[PDB]
Each structure stands twice: as structure tokens, then as C-alpha cells.
């Protein structure tokens, strides 16, 4: 107990509810803020980004 | 990254053509307090690593 790796949840949804066009809150991978999403076609991300 | 029991004289032993010794750089067969455990992959034919 209280040491190791196999933790319990304690976490939020991880919801696939990316709602574009409106203003939302976000907590993406640690970074928090408010913004508007908009879908686009991009290729500059790599497999660690 | 664990809580290992390291030797006084650690070494490794190659696997392509093994030597007379035995790769004995720890003995901690207790599935010990491992804070981190991971596996990543790399190219076998690449000359340098960084
Ligand atoms: C990371 O890879 C190593 C080597 O591929 C894994 O070690 C093997 O684990 C299996 C199952 O416990 C054993 O039967 C083999 O003898 C091990 N090989 C060696 C060379 O030690 C290791 O389990 C992998 N780790 C994770 C977290 O997947
Ligand atoms: C290496 O380990 C094997 C199996 O335990 C043993 O038979 C052999 O003698 C060991 N080698 C040395 C140099 O002690
Ligand atoms: C890296 O791996 C790829 C896939 O096999 C191979 O084509 C390439 O030659 C490797 N890189 C080097 C420097 O050998």
C-alpha cells in the first residue's frame, strides 16, 4: 500500500467529445486552458508528439 | 528503474557467442520495488546511438 505502480483510477473521463466550432475548456496532456477547436489536415506530428 | 541488489564486481556476458563467465550484475529475484519498467525499440543496423 501507498508505494509501487498499480494505482487506482482517481482520474476524469478521457472523453472523445472534441466539439469544434464552440468555446470549451481543455486539459490536454497536462496543459490547461480555454479555446475553440477546428479540425484540419496536418502531417507534422511525429509518433512522440 | 527498481530497487536492485547490485554486485561488488558487476559485468555483462554477450549473447552472440557467450563467454566462460555468467552475466552476474545483480541478484534481486524478489520482484522488487520497481518504480518504472519499460521497453523501447531501436534499429539493429544503425551505427551510432545517442
Ligand atoms: C522487455 O523485454 C525483455 C526482453 O525481450 C523481457 O524479458 C523477457 O521476459 C520474459 C517473460 O518474463 C522471459 O521469459 C524472458 O526470458 C525475458 N528475456 C530476457 C532477455 O530477460 C521483458 O519482460 C520486457 N519487459 C516488459 C515490461 O515487457
Ligand atoms: C555458469 O552457470 C552455470 C549454470 O548455473 C554453471 O554450470 C557454470 O559453472 C557457471 N559458470 C561459471 C564460470 O561458474
Ligand atoms: C533502420 O531500419 C530500416 C528498417 O529496416 C532500414 O531500412 C534502415 O536501413 C535502418 N537504418 C540504418 C541506418 O541501417
Beta bridge partners of A27: A32
Contact B43, B27 (CB under 8 A): no
CB hemisphere CA count around B26 (13 angstroms): 10
B37 lines ligand 1 (CB under 6 A): yes
| Minimum-distance ligand 2 atom for the alpha carbon of B22 | 1
* The dihedral formed by the CA atoms of A43, A22, A13 and A16, expressed in degrees to the nearest 10: -40
Residue B33 Cα to ligand 2 midpoint, Å, equals 28
User: Which one of B22, B27, B29 would you pick to mutate in the ligand 2 pocket, going by the greatest count of ligand atoms within 8 A of its CB?
Assistant: B22
What resolution, expressed in A, was reported for this entry?
Answer: 2.8
Cα A16 versus chain centre, distance: 9
* Eight-state DSSP code of residue B9: S
Q: How was this structure determined?
A: cryo-EM
What HEC string does B13-50 produce? CCCCCCCCCCCCCECCCCCCCCCCCCCCCCCCCCCCCC
B15 lines ligand 1 (CB under 6 A): no
Chain B, 5 to 34: residues with Cβ < 8 Å from chain A are: 33-34
Amino acid at each position: 500500500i501507498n508505494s509501487g505502480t498499480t494505482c487506482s483510477n482517481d482520474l476524469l473521463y478521457s472523453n472523445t467529445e472534441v466539439s469544434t466550432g464552440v468555446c470549451v475548456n481543455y486539459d490536454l496532456y497536462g496543459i490547461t486552458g480555454q479555446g475553440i477547436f477546428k479540425e484540419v489536415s496536418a502531417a507534422y506530428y511525429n509518433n512522440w508528439q | 528503474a527498481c530497487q536492485y541488489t547490485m554486485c561488488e564486481y558487476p559485468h555483462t556476458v554477450c549473447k552472440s557467442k557467450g563467454s566462460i563467465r555468467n552475466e552476474s550484475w545483480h541478484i534481486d529475484s524478489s520482484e522488487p520495488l520497481c518504480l518504472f519498467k519499460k521497453n523501447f525499440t531501436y534499429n539493429v543496423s544503425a551505427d551510432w546511438l545517442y
